[PDB]
Coordinates of C-alpha atoms and ligand atoms in Angstrom, one line a residue:
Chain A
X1 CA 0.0 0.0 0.0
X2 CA 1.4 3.6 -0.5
X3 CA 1.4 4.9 2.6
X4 CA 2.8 1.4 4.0
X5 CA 5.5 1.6 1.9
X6 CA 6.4 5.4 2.4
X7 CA 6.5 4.1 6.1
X8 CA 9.2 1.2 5.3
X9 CA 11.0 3.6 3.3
X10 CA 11.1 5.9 5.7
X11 CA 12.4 3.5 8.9
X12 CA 15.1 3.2 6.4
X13 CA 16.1 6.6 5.8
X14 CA 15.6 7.8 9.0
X15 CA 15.4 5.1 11.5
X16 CA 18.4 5.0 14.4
X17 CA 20.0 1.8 15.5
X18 CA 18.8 -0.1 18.3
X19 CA 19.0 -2.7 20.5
X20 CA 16.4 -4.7 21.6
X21 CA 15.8 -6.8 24.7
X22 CA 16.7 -9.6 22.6
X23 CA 19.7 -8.5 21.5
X24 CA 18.3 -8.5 17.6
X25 CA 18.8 -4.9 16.3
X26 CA 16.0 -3.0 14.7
X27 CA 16.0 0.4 12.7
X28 CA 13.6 2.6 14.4
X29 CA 11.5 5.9 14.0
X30 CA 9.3 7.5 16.5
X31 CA 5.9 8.9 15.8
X32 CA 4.2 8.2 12.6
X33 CA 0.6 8.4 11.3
X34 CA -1.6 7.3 8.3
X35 CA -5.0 6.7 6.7
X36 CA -7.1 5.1 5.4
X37 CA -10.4 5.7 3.8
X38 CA -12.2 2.8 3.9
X39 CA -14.4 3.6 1.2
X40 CA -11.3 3.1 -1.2
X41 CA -10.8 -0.3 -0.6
X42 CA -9.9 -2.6 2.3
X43 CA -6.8 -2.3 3.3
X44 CA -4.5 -5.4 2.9
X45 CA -1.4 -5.1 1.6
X46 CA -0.8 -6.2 -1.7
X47 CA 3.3 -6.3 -2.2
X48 CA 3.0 -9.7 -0.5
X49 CA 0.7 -11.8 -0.4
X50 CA -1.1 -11.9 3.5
X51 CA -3.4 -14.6 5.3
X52 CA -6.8 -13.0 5.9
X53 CA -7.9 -15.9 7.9
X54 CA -5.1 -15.9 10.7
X55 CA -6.2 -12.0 10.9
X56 CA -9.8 -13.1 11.2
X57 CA -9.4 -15.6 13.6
X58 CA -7.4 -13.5 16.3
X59 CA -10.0 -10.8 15.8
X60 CA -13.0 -13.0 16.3
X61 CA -11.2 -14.7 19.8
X62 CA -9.9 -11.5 20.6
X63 CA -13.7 -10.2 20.9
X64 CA -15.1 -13.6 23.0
X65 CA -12.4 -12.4 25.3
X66 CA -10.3 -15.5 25.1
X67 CA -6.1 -15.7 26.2
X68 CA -5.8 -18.7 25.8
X69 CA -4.8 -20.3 22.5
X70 CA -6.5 -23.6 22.1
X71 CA -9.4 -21.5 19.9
X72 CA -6.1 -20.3 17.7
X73 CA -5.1 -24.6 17.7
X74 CA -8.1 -25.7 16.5
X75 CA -8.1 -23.4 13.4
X76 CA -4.2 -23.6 12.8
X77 CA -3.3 -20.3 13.8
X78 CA 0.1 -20.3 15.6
X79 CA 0.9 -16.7 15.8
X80 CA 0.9 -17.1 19.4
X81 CA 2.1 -20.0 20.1
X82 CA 5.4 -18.9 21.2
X83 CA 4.4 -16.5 23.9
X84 CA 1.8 -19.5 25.1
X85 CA 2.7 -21.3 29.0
X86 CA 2.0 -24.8 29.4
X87 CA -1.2 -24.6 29.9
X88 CA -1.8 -22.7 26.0
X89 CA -2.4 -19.5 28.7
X90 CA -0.9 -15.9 27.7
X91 CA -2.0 -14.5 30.6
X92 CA -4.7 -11.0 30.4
X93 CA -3.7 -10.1 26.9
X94 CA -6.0 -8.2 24.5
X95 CA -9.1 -9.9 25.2
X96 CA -9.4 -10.3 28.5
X97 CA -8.8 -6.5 29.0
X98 CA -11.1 -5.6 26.0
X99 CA -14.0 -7.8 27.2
X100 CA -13.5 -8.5 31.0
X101 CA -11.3 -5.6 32.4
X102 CA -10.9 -6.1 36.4
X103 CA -11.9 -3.6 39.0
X104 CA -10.0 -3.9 42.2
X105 CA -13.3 -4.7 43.8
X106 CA -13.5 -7.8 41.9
X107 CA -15.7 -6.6 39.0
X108 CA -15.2 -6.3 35.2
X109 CA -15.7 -4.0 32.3
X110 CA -17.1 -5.3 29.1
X111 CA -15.5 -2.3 27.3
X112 CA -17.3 -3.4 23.6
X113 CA -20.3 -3.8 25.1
X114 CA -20.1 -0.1 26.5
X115 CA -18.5 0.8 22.8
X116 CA -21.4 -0.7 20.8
X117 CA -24.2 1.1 23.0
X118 CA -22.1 4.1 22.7
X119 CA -22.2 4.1 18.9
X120 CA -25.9 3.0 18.9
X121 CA -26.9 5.9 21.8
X122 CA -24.5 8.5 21.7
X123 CA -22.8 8.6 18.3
X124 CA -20.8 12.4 19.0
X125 CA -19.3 11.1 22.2
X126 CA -15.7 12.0 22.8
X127 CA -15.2 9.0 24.5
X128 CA -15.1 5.9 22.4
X129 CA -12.5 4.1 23.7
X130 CA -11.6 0.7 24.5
X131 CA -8.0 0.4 26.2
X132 CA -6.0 -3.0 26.5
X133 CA -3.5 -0.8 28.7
X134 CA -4.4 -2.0 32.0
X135 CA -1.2 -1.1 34.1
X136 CA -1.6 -3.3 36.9
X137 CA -2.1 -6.1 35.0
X138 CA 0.8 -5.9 32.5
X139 CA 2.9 -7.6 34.8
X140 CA 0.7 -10.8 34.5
X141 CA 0.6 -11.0 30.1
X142 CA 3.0 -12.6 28.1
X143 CA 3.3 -9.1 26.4
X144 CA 2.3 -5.9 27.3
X145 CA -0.4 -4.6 24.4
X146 CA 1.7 -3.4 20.9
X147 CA -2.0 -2.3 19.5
X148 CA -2.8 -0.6 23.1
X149 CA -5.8 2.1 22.8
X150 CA -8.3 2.8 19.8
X151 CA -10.7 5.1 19.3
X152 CA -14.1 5.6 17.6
X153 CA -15.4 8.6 16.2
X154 CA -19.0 8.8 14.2
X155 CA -19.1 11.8 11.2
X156 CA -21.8 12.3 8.3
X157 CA -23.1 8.8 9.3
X158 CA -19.4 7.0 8.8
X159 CA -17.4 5.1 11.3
X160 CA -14.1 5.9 11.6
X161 CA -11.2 4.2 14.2
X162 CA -8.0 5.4 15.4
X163 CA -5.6 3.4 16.8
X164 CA -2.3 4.0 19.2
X165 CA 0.6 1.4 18.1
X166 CA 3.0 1.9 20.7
X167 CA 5.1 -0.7 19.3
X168 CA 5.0 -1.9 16.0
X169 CA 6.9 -4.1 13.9
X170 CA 6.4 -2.9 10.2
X171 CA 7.4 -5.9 8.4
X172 CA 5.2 -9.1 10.1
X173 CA 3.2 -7.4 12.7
X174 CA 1.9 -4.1 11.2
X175 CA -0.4 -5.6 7.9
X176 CA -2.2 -8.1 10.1
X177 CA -2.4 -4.9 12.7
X178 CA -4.0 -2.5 10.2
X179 CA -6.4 -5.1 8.4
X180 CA -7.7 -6.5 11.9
X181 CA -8.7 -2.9 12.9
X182 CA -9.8 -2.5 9.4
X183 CA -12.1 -5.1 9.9
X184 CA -13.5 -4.5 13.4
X185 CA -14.5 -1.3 11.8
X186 CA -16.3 -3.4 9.2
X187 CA -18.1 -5.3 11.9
X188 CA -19.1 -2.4 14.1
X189 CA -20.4 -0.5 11.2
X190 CA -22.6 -3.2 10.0
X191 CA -24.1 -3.8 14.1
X192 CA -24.8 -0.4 14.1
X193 CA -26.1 0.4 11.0
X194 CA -23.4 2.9 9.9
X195 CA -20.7 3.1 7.1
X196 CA -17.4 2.8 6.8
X197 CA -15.1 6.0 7.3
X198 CA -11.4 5.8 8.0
X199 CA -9.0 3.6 9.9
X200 CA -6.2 6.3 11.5
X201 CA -3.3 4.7 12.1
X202 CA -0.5 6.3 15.0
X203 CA 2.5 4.7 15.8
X204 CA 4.8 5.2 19.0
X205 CA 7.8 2.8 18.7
X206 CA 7.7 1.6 14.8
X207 CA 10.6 -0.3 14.0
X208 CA 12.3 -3.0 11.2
X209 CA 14.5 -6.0 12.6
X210 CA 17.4 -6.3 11.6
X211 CA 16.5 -9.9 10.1
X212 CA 13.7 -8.2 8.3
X213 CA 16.2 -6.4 5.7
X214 CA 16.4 -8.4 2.9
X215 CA 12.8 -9.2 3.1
X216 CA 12.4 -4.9 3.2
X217 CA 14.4 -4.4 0.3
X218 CA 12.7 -7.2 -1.8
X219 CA 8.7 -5.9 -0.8
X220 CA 10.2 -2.0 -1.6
X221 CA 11.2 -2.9 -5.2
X222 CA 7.2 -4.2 -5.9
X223 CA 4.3 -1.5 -6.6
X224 CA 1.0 -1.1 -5.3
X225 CA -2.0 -2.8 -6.4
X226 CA -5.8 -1.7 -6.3
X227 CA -7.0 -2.5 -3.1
X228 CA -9.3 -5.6 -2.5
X229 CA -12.8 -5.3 -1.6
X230 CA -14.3 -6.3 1.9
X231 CA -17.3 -8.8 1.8
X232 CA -19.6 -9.7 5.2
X233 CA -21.9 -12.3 3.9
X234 CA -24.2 -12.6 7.0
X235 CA -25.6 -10.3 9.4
X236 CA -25.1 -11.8 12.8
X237 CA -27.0 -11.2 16.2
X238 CA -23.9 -9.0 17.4
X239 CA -20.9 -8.2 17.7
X240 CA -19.6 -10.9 19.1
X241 CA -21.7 -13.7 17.1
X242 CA -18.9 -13.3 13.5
X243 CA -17.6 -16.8 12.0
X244 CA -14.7 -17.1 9.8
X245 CA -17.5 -17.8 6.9
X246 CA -18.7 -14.7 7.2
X247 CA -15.6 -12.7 5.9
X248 CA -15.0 -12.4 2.0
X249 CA -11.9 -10.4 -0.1
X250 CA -12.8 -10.0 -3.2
X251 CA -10.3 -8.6 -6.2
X252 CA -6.9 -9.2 -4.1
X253 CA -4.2 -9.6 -5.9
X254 CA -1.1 -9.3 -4.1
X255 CA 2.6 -10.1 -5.1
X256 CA 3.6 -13.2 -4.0
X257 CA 3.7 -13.8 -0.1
X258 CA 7.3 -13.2 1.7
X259 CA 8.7 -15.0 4.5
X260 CA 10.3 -13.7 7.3
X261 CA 12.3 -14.7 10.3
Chain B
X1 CA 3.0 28.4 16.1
X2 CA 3.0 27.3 12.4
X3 CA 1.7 23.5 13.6
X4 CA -0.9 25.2 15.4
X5 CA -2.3 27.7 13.2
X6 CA -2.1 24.6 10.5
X7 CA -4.1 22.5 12.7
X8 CA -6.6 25.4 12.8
X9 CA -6.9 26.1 9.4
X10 CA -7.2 21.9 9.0
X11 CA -9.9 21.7 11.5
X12 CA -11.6 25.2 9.6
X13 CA -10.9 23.2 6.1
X14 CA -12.1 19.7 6.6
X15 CA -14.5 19.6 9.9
X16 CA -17.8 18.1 10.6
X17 CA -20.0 20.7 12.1
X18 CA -21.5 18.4 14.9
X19 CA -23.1 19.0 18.0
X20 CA -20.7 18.6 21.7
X21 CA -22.3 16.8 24.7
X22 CA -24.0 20.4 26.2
X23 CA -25.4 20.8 22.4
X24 CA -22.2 23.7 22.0
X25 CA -21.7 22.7 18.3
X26 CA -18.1 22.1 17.5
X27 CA -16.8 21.3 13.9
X28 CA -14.3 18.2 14.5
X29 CA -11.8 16.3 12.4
X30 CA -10.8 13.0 13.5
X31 CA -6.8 12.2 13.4
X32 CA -3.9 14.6 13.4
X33 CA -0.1 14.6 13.9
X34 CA 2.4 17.2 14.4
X35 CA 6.1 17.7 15.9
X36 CA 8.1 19.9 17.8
X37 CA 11.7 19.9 18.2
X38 CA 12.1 21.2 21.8
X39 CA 15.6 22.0 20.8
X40 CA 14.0 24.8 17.8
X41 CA 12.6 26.8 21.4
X42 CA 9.9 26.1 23.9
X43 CA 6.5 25.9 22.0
X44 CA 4.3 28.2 23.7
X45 CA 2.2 29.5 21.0
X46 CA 2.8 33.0 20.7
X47 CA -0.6 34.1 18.2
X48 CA -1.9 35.4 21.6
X49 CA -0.4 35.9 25.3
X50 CA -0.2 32.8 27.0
X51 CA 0.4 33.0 30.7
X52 CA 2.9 30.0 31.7
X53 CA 2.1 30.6 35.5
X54 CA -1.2 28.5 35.2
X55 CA 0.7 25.7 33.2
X56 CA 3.3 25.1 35.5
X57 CA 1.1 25.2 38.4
X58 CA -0.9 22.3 36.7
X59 CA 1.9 20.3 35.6
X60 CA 3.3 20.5 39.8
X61 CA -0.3 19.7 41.0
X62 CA -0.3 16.5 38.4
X63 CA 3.2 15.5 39.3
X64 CA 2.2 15.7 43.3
X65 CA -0.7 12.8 42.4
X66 CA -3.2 16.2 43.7
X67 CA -6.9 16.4 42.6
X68 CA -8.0 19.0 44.7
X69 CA -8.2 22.6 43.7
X70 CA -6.9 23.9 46.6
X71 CA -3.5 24.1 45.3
X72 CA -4.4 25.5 42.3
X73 CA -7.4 28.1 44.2
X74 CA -4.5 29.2 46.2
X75 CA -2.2 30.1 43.5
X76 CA -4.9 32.0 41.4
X77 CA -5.2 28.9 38.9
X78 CA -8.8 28.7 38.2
X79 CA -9.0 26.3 35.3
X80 CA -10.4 23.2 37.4
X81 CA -12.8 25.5 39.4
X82 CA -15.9 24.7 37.5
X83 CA -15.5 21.2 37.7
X84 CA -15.0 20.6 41.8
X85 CA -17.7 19.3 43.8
X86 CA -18.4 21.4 47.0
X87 CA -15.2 20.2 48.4
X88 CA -13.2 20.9 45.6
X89 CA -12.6 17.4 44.4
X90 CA -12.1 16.0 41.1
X91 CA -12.4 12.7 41.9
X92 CA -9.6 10.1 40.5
X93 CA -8.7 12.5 37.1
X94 CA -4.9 12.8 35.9
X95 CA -2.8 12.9 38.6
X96 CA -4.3 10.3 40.7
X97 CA -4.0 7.6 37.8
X98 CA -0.3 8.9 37.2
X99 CA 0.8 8.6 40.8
X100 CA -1.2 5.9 42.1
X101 CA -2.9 3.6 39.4
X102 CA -5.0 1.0 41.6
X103 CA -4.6 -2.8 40.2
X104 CA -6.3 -5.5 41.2
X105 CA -4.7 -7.3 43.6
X106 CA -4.3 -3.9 45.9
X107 CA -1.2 -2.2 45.1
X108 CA -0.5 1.4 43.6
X109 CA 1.7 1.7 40.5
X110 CA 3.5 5.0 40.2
X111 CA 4.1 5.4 36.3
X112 CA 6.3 8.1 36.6
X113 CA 8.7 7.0 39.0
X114 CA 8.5 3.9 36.9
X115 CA 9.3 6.0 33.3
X116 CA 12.0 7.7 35.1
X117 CA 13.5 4.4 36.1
X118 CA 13.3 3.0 32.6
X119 CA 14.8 6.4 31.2
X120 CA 17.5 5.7 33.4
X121 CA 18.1 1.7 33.2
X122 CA 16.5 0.5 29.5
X123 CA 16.0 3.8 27.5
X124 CA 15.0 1.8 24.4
X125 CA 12.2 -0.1 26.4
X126 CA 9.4 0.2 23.8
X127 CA 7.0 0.3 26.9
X128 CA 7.8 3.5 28.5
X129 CA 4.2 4.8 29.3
X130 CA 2.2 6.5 31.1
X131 CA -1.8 6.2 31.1
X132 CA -4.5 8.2 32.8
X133 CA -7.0 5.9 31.0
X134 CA -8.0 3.6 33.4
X135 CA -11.3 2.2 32.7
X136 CA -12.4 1.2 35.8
X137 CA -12.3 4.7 37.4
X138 CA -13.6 7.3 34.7
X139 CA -17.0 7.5 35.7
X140 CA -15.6 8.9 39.1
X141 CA -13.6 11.4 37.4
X142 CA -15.2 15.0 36.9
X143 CA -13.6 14.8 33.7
X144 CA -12.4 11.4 31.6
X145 CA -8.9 12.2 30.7
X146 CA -8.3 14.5 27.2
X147 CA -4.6 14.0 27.3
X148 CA -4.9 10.1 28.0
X149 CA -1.8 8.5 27.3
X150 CA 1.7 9.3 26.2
X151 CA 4.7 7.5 25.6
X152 CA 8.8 8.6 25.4
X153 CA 11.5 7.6 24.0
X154 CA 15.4 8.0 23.5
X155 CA 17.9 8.1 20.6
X156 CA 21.0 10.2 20.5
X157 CA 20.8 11.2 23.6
X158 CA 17.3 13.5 23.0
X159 CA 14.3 12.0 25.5
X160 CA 11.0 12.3 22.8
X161 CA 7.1 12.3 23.9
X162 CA 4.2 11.5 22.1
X163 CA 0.8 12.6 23.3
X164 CA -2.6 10.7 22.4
X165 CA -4.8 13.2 23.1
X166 CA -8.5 11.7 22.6
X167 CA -10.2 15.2 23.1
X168 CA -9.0 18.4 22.4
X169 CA -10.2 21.8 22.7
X170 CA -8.4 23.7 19.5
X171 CA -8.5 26.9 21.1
X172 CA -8.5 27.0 24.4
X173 CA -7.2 23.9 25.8
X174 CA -4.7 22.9 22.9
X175 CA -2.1 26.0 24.1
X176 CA -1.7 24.7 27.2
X177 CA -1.5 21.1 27.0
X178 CA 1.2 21.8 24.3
X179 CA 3.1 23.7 27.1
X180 CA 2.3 21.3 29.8
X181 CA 3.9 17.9 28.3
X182 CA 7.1 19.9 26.8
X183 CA 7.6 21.1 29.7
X184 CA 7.6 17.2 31.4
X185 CA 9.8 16.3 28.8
X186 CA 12.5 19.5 29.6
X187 CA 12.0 18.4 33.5
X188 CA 12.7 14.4 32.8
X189 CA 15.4 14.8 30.6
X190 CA 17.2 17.3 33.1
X191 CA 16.2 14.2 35.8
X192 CA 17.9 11.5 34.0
X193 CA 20.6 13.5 32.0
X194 CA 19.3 13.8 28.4
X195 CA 18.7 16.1 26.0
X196 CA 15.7 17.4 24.9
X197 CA 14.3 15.9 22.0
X198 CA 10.6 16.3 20.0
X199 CA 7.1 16.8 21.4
X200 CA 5.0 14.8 19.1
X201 CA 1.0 15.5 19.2
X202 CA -1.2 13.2 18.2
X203 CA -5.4 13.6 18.4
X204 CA -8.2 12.0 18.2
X205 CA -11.9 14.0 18.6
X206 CA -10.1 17.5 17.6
X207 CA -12.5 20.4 17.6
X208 CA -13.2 24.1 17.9
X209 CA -15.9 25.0 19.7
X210 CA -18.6 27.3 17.3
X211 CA -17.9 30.1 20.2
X212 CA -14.1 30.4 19.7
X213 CA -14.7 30.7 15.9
X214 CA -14.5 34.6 15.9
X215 CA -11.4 34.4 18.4
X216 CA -9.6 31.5 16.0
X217 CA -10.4 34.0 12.8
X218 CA -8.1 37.1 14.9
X219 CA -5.8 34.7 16.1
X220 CA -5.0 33.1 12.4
X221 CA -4.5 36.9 11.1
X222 CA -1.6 37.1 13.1
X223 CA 2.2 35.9 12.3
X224 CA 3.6 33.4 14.9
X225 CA 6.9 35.4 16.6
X226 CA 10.1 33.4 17.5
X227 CA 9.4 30.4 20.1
X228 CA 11.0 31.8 23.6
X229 CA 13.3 29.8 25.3
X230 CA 13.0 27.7 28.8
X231 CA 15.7 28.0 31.7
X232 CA 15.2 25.6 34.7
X233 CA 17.1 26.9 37.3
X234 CA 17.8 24.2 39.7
X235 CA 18.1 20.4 39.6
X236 CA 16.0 19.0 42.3
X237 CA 16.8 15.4 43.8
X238 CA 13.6 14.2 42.1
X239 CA 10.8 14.9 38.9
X240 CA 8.6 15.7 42.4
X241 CA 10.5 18.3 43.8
X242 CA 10.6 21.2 41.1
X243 CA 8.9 24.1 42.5
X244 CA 7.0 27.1 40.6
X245 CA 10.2 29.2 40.7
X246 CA 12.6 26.9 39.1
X247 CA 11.3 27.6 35.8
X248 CA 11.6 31.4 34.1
X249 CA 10.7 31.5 29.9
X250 CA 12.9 33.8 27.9
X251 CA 12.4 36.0 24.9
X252 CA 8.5 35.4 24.8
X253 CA 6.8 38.1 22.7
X254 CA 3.4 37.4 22.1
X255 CA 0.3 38.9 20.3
X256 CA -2.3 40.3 22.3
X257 CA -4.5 38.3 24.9
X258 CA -7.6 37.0 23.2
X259 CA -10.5 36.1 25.3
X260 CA -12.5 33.0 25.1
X261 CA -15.8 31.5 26.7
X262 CA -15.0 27.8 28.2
Ligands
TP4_301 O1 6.1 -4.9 18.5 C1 6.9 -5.7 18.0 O2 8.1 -5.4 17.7 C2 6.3 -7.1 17.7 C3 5.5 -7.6 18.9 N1 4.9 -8.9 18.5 C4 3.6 -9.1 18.4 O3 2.8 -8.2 18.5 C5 3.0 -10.5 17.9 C6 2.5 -11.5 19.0 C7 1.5 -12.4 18.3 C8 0.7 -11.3 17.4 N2 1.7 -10.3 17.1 S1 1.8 -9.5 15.6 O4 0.5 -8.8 15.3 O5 3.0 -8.5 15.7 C9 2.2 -10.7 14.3 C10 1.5 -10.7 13.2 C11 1.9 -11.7 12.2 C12 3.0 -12.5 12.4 C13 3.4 -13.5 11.4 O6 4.3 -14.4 11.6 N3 2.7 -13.6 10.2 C14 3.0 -14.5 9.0 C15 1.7 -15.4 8.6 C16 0.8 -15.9 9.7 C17 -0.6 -16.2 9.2 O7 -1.2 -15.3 8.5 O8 -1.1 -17.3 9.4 C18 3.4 -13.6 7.9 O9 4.4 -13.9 7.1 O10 2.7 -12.5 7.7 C19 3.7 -12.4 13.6 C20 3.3 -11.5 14.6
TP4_302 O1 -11.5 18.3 25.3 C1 -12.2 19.4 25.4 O2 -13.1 19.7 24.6 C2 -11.9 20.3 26.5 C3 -12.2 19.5 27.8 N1 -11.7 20.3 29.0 C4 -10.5 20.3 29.6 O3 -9.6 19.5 29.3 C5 -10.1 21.4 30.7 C6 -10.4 20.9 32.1 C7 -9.6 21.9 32.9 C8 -8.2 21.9 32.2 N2 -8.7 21.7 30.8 S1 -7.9 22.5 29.5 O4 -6.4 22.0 29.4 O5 -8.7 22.1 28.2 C9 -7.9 24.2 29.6 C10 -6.8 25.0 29.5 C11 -6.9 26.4 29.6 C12 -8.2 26.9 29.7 C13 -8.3 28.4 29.8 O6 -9.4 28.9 30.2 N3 -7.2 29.2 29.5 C14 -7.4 30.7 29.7 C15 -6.6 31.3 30.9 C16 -6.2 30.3 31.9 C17 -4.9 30.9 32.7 O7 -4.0 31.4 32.0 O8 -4.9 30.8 33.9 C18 -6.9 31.2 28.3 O9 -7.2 32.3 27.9 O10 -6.1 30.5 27.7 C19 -9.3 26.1 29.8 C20 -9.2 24.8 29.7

């Protein structure tokens, strides 16, 4: 996508060397923002080929509120398998805080649940947000939230999201990141009877690995194709009721797919 | 400041005239960015007289972990006034959720002291955060956090910031807050020798409020002036000792004062 690839370009250009905590270095730029109408297209990248249905099925078990990755095993999604204890548990990752954030008095906060009746009720609010940035409980995930605070925002009868990336890895993570959000805004917009607008992306951290290079160079040297189109075949209940089935891309026709370490 | 009077002329340009939660219409855009290199001057917009006494005051009563106006009613800072109970609580807003973020189990994180040690002891930590948005307590706030969550960062030596702010008054809030987080940035760099690098703003639901149009109008007939400088004085032992007279701005030269309705 254009904007994607200015942004590889420009961790190139610009980025500084760092260090990581695993001693792999990385290329790295803070503060970086793009968009994407959603009227235009979907937006999937098309200089390699990605796997909707990995990005589909961490979306859907991210909304049930589910850490642990069995759900992710049973459709062959290993993505998280790494990160996974024993037990297949990752601790309160994304879901949990999205769907069952805990109070100190032993309650939780269903934060789409609040976002859907805020869309449906009060459409101008300022305050759209669902957060997976729950400080006292980073210490218990096996990692702290990357895609860590989005927000809604309701113009001319067009959903629009923005979210805040504070760390974001531009070659693996960041096309799954920007066509899951992509999607969600799909989903919400159908549930509440609105259109799409735009998908905002902000980064904090946004960095290359070093082992990502070649792979950098190679997706650089391909151009752009028309963006793919977004098909929901069913209507569910709610929110939270979407199968894989439901989700079609129609007219994607991306370079071939490139892997990476 | 040319970012700011860009971002006004954007939010002029492209925004949706809607209606705010008291029916005050605003005209919105969703999504902006901009940058300031701290090292260029201090960015205290200078289109109309800013008064850096309020901001600093603020910025101390945050870092204390205070949400009483008290503080602030003592030192002629009225900003919060309006939204104290009869007490002159806020309930848990900013500095509270900075200070003392309640988890769980029954401890109290304090994300600044724990930035200042990652500043110190893993700089490129790609976690370094702090977060007034804690879900469990906004509706006891008198006001859900605008500037909710910011991050920093390190390379070369220059400590960076970036703001998410998810509501912003164009106007009459944006000024401030501008002024309030570079100044954090100046004071933790000074705390764990660094240099100062950029400010980087980031909104979400950015408006102007259809009573500050008139007042935007003057403001973006006016030519920003050189940014003044910031001298801080002293180096306290810690980021929660500064006091109000450690900080003096130099060669600010503003346009005139311009009056707004809140
Ligand atoms: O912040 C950071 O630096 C990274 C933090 N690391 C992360 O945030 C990891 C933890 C697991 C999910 N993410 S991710 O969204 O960044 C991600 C996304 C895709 C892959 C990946 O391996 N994709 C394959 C195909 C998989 C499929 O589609 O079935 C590909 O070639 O695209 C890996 C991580
Ligand atoms: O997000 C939104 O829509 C706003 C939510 N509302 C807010 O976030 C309010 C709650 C109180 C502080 N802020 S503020 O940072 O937006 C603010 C800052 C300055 C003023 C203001 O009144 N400044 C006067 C003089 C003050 C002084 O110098 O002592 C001026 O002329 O600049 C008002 C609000």
């Amino acid at each position: 996508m254009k904007q994607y690839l200015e942004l590889m370009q420009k961790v190139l250009d610009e980025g500084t060397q760092k260090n990581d905590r695993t001693g792999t270095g990385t290329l790295s730029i803070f503060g970086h923002q793009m968009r994407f109408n959603l009227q235009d297209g979907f937006p999937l990248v098309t200089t390699k080929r990605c796997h909707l249905r990995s990005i589909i099925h961490e979306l859907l078990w991210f909304l049930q509120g589910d850490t642990n990755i069995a759900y992710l095993h049973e459709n062959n999604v290993t993505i998280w398998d790494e990160w996974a204890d024993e037990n297949g548990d990752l601790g309160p990752v994304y879901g949990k805080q999205w769907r069952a954030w805990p109070t100190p008095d032993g309650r939780h906060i269903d934060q789409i649940t609040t976002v859907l009746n805020q869309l449906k009720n009060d459409p101008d609010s300022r305050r759209i947000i669902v957060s997976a940035w729950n400080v006292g409980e980073l210490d218990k995930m096996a990692l702290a939230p990357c895609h860590a605070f989005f927000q809604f925002y309701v113009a001319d009868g067009k959903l629009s999201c923005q979210l805040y990336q504070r760390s974001c890895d531009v070659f693996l993570g960041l096309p799954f990141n920007i066509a899951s959000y992509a999607l969600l805004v799909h989903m919400m917009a159908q549930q509440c009877d609105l259109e799409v607008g735009d998908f905002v992306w902000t980064g904090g951290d946004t960095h290359l690995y070093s082992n990502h290079m070649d792979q950098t160079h190679l997706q650089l040297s391909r151009e752009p194709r028309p963006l793919p189109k977004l098909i929901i075949k069913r209507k569910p209940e709610s929110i939270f009721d979407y199968r894989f089935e439901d989700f079609e891309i129609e007219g994607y026709d991306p370079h071939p797919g490139i892997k990476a370490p």
